[PDB]
């Protein structure tokens, strides 16, 4: 049938016409009558792509296929303008001729399925992990601390990632294209920048909050009230939202080269082409600036914890270490991505696109690590056990 074979590359009337064109041709009928049912469909794939006359141009290639010399015809089909025009399309056709199997199309199909299950588990781990953190604090009255309010704000940021960013960013790789329009493409990117910016800014608030707490008689009591804590959280999303949506919605990120304009007008293209000014400025504002002050402030918190230091003291000192892992994990998962943004813009085509996507997804997985780190604190660990295990 080879209907799915052409469906995997980039309708019934064109297939029947190409089959009739091969039988009427006097240079394709002797070759078509000497190939197995698998290789016959690969021959029609070239006629439907190139043409009836273009396929007949390969006089040396069809002669090797007629002599059943697959290994010699594999190197002969790699020396043409068709093999250099589309390297991904030709390599699957040559492999189909050489092996006589669908291994070139099956391996590319199993990879989508196999990687699709993995990315679905990431979404499930992020959502289920963060919804557990939200529920544990919102239910138990003993976990109603100012830091947990910021943890709720941080878990909400990671929750939207696994509900609006990661799922739509996963279908963009599996389908190799974008099937949501340009309206949601500029919105999906806006949410992406927002949650990451709101995360590093929320962690920055925690570090400052823990410094005011450690300079207090209780050494661990936040000086903020319950109402003031919600005000800070509200102002964090307002500030981060202004440094995320406004640069995107007002089209301050757009590039100038023709490849970007053609991708902006294309509904099926959602590549985040940024200019040399926005890529550095936004990374500095939305990541680098809050990162430096977060490390600097929280390092002095650790310095005051060792300078002032019972059984209760170790429990709350480990809580500061728990927040130090949250800031450390968030750093060691987004820093390589934002380093590339500086590298990719300064020198074009120095970082591969696959590497850029990979490091971007390392930060996506970071949105599911925080609930597992909260299990270090027995206060969060028990609250999870009461909700899930004990029930």
């Amino acid at each position, epitope marked *: 049938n080879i209907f799915e074979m052409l469906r995997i590359d980039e309708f019934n009337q064109d297939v029947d016409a190409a089959v009739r064109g091969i039988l009427r041709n006097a240079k394709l009928k002797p070759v078509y009558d000497s190939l197995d049912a698998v290789r016959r469909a690969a021959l029609i794939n070239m006629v439907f792509q190139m043409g009836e006359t273009g396929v007949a141009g390969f006089t040396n290639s069809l002669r090797m296929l007629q002599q059943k010399r697959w290994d010699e015809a594999a190197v002969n089909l790699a020396k043409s303008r068709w093999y250099n025009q589309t390297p991904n399309r030709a390599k699957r056709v040559i492999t189909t001729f050489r092996t006589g199997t669908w291994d070139a199309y099956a391996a590319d199909e199993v990879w989508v399925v196999g990687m699709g299950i993995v990315m679905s588990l990431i979404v499930l781990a992020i959502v289920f992990g963060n919804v557990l953190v939200i529920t544990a604090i919102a239910k138990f*009255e*003993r*976990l*109603q*601390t*100012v*830091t*947990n309010y910021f943890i709720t704000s941080l878990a909400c940021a990671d929750l939207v990632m696994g509900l609006a960013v990661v799922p739509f960013g996963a279908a963009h790789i599996l389908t190799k294209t974008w099937t949501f329009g340009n309206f949601w493409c500029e919105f999906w990117t806006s949410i992406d920048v927002l949650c990451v910016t709101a995360s590093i800014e929320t962690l920055c608030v925690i570090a400052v909050d*823990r410094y005011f*707490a450690i300079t*207090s*008689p*209780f050494k*661990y*009591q*936040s*000086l903020l*009230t*319950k*109402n003031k804590a919600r005000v800070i959280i509200l102002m964090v999303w307002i500030v981060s939202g202004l440094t995320s949506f406004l640069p995107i919605q007002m089209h301050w990120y757009r590039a100038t080269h023709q490849e970007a304009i053609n991708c902006y007008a294309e509904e099926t293209c959602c590549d985040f082409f940024t200019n040399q000014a926005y890529a550095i400025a936004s990374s500095i504002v939305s990541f680098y600036v809050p990162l430096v002050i977060m490390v600097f402030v929280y390092s002095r918190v650790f310095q005051e914890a060792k300078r002032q230091l019972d059984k*209760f003291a170790l429990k*709350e000192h480990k*809580a*500061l270490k*728990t*927040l130090g892992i949250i800031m450390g994990t968030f750093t060691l998962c987004w820093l390589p991505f934002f380093i590339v943004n500086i590298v990719h813009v300064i020198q074009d085509n120095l970082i591969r696109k696959e590497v850029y996507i990979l490091l971007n997804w390392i930060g996506y997985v970071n949105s599911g690590f925080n609930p597992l780190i909260y299990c270090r*604190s027995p*206060d*969060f660990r028990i609250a999870f056990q009461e909700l899930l295990c004990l029930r």
Partner: nanobody
Amino acid sequence: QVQLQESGGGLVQAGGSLRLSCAASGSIFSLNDMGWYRQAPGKLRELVAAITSGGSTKYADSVKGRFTISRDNAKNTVYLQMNSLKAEDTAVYYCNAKVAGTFSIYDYWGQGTQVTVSS
């Protein structure tokens, strides 16, 4: 390293009045929720009055309208006005301090003052 010290207890005739106070020292106090608990002879401890950080006061049905809880953040002391004392109010009153930490709220208690009502 917080400290809770009650005061104002003692002996009082039935129907009289008493004013309990609890000095808190070791935290901010203005941000922590206070409360008063009492321990009757041969009975479990019972919450009778509790005031939040904002000022929301909660009382028990057995002491509703007769007791009145309040606090003074300038002196870091939570007060408990006890009016129309009955024989059932004869208990050892404890001062509770819910100081919030990093991830959880820690409950701290005072030594406890004893209030006896003679009929």
